[PDB]
Amino acid sequence: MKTPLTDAVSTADSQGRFLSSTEIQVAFGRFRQAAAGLSAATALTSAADALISGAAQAVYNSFPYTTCMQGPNYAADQRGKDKCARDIGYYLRMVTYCLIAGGTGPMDEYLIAGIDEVNRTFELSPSWYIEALKYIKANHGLAGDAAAEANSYLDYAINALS
């Protein structure tokens, strides 16, 4: 579950050794970044709804066919319009989890592992989700380390979906 702390414990454990100053240094890094990370999460949480509609609408703009094609993979009805916001919601929620944990762990485990099968099975296009994430980058409005960090996760999702 890739986070600085669990990752450090994990190597030590797998080499049968007590934590050394290396792992303490890992912790230092984590705890120093956490300041920015926790901020950015509170920030994203509070802009949650604006970000989700925003993104959803962005995707419908880049890909207008998704709001007119019939059939369950698209958002021409309200059912689908809802599934879509739900999923973008999921992406953003994971990003906040990443920010809190200080690593991709939570997104790795709750969203990315198996995404390829879901999208292939249900005929969803990764291109759509990439657009949603792109929007969240342009519009989250965080500054400094909170920004560079949140962006790292948003870009990571993009890389997974490319």
Ligand X SMILES: *[C@H](C)[C@H]1/C(=C/c2[nH]c(/C=C3N=C(/C=C4\NC(=O)C(CC)=C4C)C(C)=C\3CCC(=O)O)c(CCC(=O)O)c2C)NC(=O)[C@@H]1C
Contacts 24+ apart (CB under 8 A), 121-127: 122/72, 122/73, 123/73, 124/73, 125/63, 126/161, 126/162, 127/63
Question: Interface mask (CB under 8 A) for other proteins, residues 124-143, using x and -?
Answer: --------------------
Residue (64 or 82) nearer to other proteins, CB: 82
Q: How far is the CB of 55 from other proteins (least distance, A)?
A: 16
Residue (50 or 69) nearer to its own copies, CB: 69
The binding site for its own copies (CB under 8 A) comprises 2-4, 7, 10-11, 18, 20-22, 24-30, 32-33, 63-65, 98, 102-105, 116, 120-121, 123, 125-127, 149, 152-153, 156, 159, 161-162
Q: 104 in helix, strand or coil?
A: coil
Contact partner at residue 145 from ligand X, other proteins, its own copies, none, CB < 5 to 8 Å by partner kind: ligand X
Residue 65 contacts residue 75 (beta carbons within 8 Å):
no
Owner of token pair 């207008």: 64
For residue 132, give the amino acid letter. A
Owner of token pair 């200080």: 102
Residue (35 or 118) nearer to ligand X, CB: 35
d(CA 151, CA 69): 32
Q: Is residue 10 classed exposed, middle or buried when 0-12, 13-18 and 19+ CB atoms within 10 A define those classes?
A: middle
The residues binding other proteins (CB under 8 A) are: 1, 3, 5-6, 8-10, 12-13, 16-21, 23-24, 27-28, 31, 34-35, 38, 41-42, 44-45, 48, 72, 93, 96-97, 100-102, 105-106, 109-115, 117-118, 121-122, 147-148, 151-152, 155-156, 158-159, 162
